[PDB]
């Protein structure tokens, strides 16, 4: 029951329930009201003076003293270069190398902020060159199929790269 439109960046169908009609029953509703959320946040700010400011300042300091290697601390991470799941460190290394291929050397500065600037800029590149994995299939009689992976250069367009960056890889728990 929210605003449905088409994204002009990716061409995807977008649904926006915020500020939508108020519910008329007890079914789950995503139509949050911005005014009410802001009123609740202002009440929180009034009851805890300086809390938002202190939290923002501390987060800013931590970000300014945070390096690119903080991203290796994750588990299986979606890798857009292979459109697969790879260990967080492997995915970060692959992203850094691909960015190097596309004149994006922010990760060299060391901080997380320059690397995030590089990500933002990557979203604007008309094309993307990277290293991906390609498998060769061999017929081993038993017949069975044997897979030999290897690294190969690849190129994708701006919209494809943007969709890969915004992609989530889903699995079962």
């Amino acid at each position: 029951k929210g605003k449905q439109y088409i994204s002009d960046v990716t061409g995807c169908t977008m649904v926006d329930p915020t500020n939508g009609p108020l519910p008329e029953d007890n079914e789950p509703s995503a139509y949050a009201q911005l005014d009410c959320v802001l009123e609740a946040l202002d009440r929180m700010d009034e009851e805890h003076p300086g809390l938002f400011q202190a939290a923002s300042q501390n987060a800013m300091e931590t970000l300014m003293v945070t390096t690119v290697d903080k991203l290796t601390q994750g588990r299986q991470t979606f890798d857009w270069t292979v459109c697969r799941n790879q260990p967080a460190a492997t995915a970060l290394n692959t992203t850094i190398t691909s960015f190097r291929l596309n004149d994006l050397n922010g990760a060299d500065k060391g901080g997380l902020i320059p690397f995030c600037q590089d990500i933002i800029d990557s979203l604007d590149r008309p094309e993307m060159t990277f290293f991906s994995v390609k498998n060769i299939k061999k017929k081993l009689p038993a017949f069975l199929i044997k897979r030999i992976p290897m690294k190969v250069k690849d190129k994708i367009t701006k919209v494809e790269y943007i969709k890969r960056a915004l992609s989530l890889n889903t699995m079962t728990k």
Binding site: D69, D108, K109, G110
Partner: protein, 45 residues
Amino acid sequence: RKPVGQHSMLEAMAHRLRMDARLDYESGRMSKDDFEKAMAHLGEI
């Protein structure tokens, strides 16, 4: 401790090995011939 630096690993290693070789030479740990070999390899690199 996590190493820190925006320079390449090759340059850091080269400088560290240069310093180690020179200090071994000055401390007597390395002789003339080994020092000449080490300096030649470092310069070639």
